[PDB]
Structure 1
Amino acid sequence: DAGTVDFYGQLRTELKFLEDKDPTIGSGSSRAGVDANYTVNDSLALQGKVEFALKDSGDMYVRNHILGVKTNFGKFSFGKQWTTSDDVYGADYSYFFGGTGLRYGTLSDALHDSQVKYVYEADSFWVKAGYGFPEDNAKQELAELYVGATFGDLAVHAGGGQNRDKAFKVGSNTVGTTTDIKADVTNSYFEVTGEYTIGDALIGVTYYNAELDVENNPLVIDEDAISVAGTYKVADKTKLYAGYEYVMQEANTGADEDGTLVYLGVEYKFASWARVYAEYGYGDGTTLGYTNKGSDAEVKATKVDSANNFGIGARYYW
């Protein structure tokens, strides 16, 4: 009948060496929050949550702001949250680079501030979904559905959704006097994923398919994407990970394109509240845009070459 109040956070600190650039030091995506939960009876519980950022860069601001109601019929969560998409994710186990090949948030950056989200667990067969209120085109249209289920040692999921931005930035031409090109884009995407636990080892594979149509315009981009990845706990506190990520983008204009991302890294944990990371990442070719869930990094649509990247992490959790 009573409740729990958890005050939690991370203090990320990163040292990064990215292709063609200088060393950076500073915060990663440090944040701090408060999960408050209260069980009323057996068919009713309540949640109040609010995470905010402690990045070293801009003004500080709220990241998630949530009212949750759990029932017999499932949990409904309301307000500013990450997309159901991002919660489900897919097979990327990096803390820096990588996450390309998951194509759910080309337009969303994994976020919609004005959304309703549903969850339902069972004899671990589960269902998650969400809807984004466009709050009169101040926000994106969003709608997603995923479903999964574990078979003892195998773990599966599939689903997708549809996200649209009426005024999304597609380019720039300045002429002196600097302006960007807006355009109304729809991203309609689907995935399937499997994960296999072999004691220390873990393997994962995801396939993403995705369609970017533009209204008042013939253009269409079919993306088709394969992530394969895994982790292996070696010593007592030590985990290694890696992944290959291959993406192909056909345009309806004929124009074909691809992109490759490879990573290899190590999570050591002095404790659970004290972790350090080291990761290499090789990239070549094109992304249309992606989010690394581990760093919270956004990479906007780009083409890379010859592309080496190292990242050294040190976090304090609470």
Structure 2
Amino acid sequence: EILKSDAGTVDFYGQLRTELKFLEDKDPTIGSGSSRAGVDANYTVNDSLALQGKVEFADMYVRNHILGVKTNFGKFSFGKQWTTSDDVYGADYSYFFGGTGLRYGTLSDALHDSQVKYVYEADSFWVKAGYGFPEDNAKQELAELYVGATFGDLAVHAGGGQNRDKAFKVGSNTVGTTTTDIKADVTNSYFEVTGEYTIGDALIGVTYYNAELDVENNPLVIDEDAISVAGTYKVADKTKLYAGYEYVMQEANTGADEDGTLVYLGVEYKFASWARVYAEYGYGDGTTLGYTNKGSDAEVKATKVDSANNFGIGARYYW
């Protein structure tokens, strides 16, 4: 982390991972993928009024590009960032496969680029919010607002946001010999409520998430209604169990009724505060319109699947 300081520290940090996923009916895959490293700064001036320059890397691309102003009340950060709703997330405690209950990232990779984010804290009660300038307009229209609080053991948060790409690629279709693509103007209209109950060794999360997508010049409705339950039991001091049950159902305005279930189950040994393994088993079934697993950053395309088993092992090295 820290390097030179006086009124402002200069973080340098990162996480070497190595992840082995074993999705159904494919080869085992490996990789340092999701590994990252970056450098953050800080510098106070008057009162409570300071900055931070966080910049991340991960084939060295750029996951964050923050140029942020701590203020006399809140904080305002401008640059490439995770969506606010990805920071807030919900009840996925999984390292590999969960996150299907959470319907903000149906379009936007959880990762808009010309974004600006307002965080204000005080108390337990926090208020986070985010806006995206669609510079070009090919970039999505994005706006998010989120509240939260905590009352002893119960840590509650609600919020939502809307998300619209002008030309969201879906996929192809072939007219025998003429491959047209399917690229439409579509809008993710999401709202969520979550609770997290912390009781000694235990944790229990439930997250309610509603979403809706629809196209400009088109008669079309899809009502994502979602739920997640999950929790962590701390079975040793170093070890930790986790599992979770996610369920989303999708009502078409044109009759069609589909859904899909995910059960994860796994474990996380924490050797030290820079080492940890984690082994995970996802069972699934049914449709998703695509999601993002925050933990592994494993950003999954819209898809329909069978009763299938998937395993995940991987370790990390922090600095």
Aligned to 1:87, the other structure's residue is in SS state helix
Q: How far off is 1:175 after superposition?
A: 4.2
TM, length-normalised to structure 1: 0.96
In 2, Cα distance between equivalents of 1:235 and 1:104: 34
User: Runs (4+) of structure 1 moved beyond 2 Å?
Assistant: 174-179
Corresponding residue of 1:296:
297
State, as a whole percentage, how many aligned pairs show the same letter.
100
- Please tell me whether the aligned partners of residues 138 and 167 of structure 2 are also in contact (alpha carbons under 8 angstroms): no
> 1:116, 1:234 → 2: CA distance?
40
Q: Secondary structure at the residue paired with 2:289?
A: strand
Deviations 1:165-186 (A, max 9, x none): 1101123113465442101001
What is the alpha-carbon distance in structure 2 between the residues aligned to residue 34 and residue 24 of structure 1? 29
SS at match of 2:87: helix
- In terms of mean alpha carbon deviation, does 89-98 or 171-180 score higher? 171-180
d(CA) in 2 for partners of 1:264, 1:32:
28
Give unmatched runs, 5+ long, in structure 1: 54-58
> What residue number does 2:225 align with?
224
Match of 1:112 in 2: 112
Give yes or no for contact 2:274–2:317 (8 Å, CA) kept in 1: yes
Aligned pairs, number: 313
1:215-247 per-residue CA deviation (whole Å, 9 max, x = no partner) reads 100111001000011001111200111100010
Bigger shift: residues 168-177 or 304-313: 168-177
- Distance in 1 between the 2:149 and 2:300 partners? 31
* Structure 2 residue matching 1:194: 3-state secondary structure: strand
Q: Supply the distance in 2 between the matched residues of 1:153 and 1:16 (Cα, whole angstroms).
A: 34
Which residue in 2 is equivalent to 1:56?
none
Per-residue CA shift, 1:40-69, capped at 9, x if unaligned?
23320111110011xxxxx32111001111
**3-state SS, counterpart of residue 241 of structure 1:** strand
Contact in 1 for aligned 2:264/2:282 (Cα 8 Å): yes
Q: Which is worse superposed, 254-263 or 21-30?
A: 21-30
Alpha-carbon separation, structure 1, partners of 2:23 and 2:225? 27
Q: What is residue 237 of structure 1 aligned with on the other side?
A: 238
Residues in 1 aligned to 2:266 and 2:7: alpha-carbon distance in whole angstroms: 42
For residue 298 of structure 1, report the CA deviation from its aligned partner. Answer: 1.1
What SS does the aligned partner of 1:169 have? strand
Report the Cα distance in structure 2 between the residues aligned to 1:84 and 1:167, rounded to whole angstroms. Answer: 22
**CA–CA separation in structure 2 for the residues paired with 1:104 and 1:303:** 19
Residue 199 (structure 1) shift:
0.9
- Relative to its length, the structure with more strand (as a share) is 1
Q: Are the aligned partners of 2:138 and 2:165 in contact in 1 as well (CA < 8 Å)?
A: no
Give 1:280 shift. Answer: 0.5
Q: What's the CA shift string for 1:255-280, capped at 9, x where partnerless? A: 11100000000000111111111000
- Listed one character per residue, the Cα deviations across residues 70-113 of structure 1 (whole Å, up to 9, x for unaligned) are 11231000011110010000110000001001001101010100
**Conservation of the 8 A alpha-carbon contact between 2:269 and 2:276:** yes
CA contact (8 A) 2:195 2:207 kept: yes
Which of 26, 33, 42 in structure 2 is aligned with 1:37? 42
Paired with 2:21 and 2:65, the residues of 1 have a C-alpha distance of: 30
Give the Cα–Cα distance (whole angstroms) in 2 for the partners of residues 281 and 161 of structure 1: 28
Unaligned 5+ segments in structure 2 are 1-5
1:170-207 per-residue CA deviation (whole Å, 9 max, x = no partner) reads 23113465442101001110000001111110110000
Q: State the partner residue of 1:172.
A: 172
Question: Quick one: distance in 1 between partners of 2:246 and 2:17?
Answer: 26
Q: Which moved more, 1:175-184 or 1:256-265?
A: 175-184
- Please give the root-mean-square deviation of Cα atoms over the aligned residues, in Å: 1.1
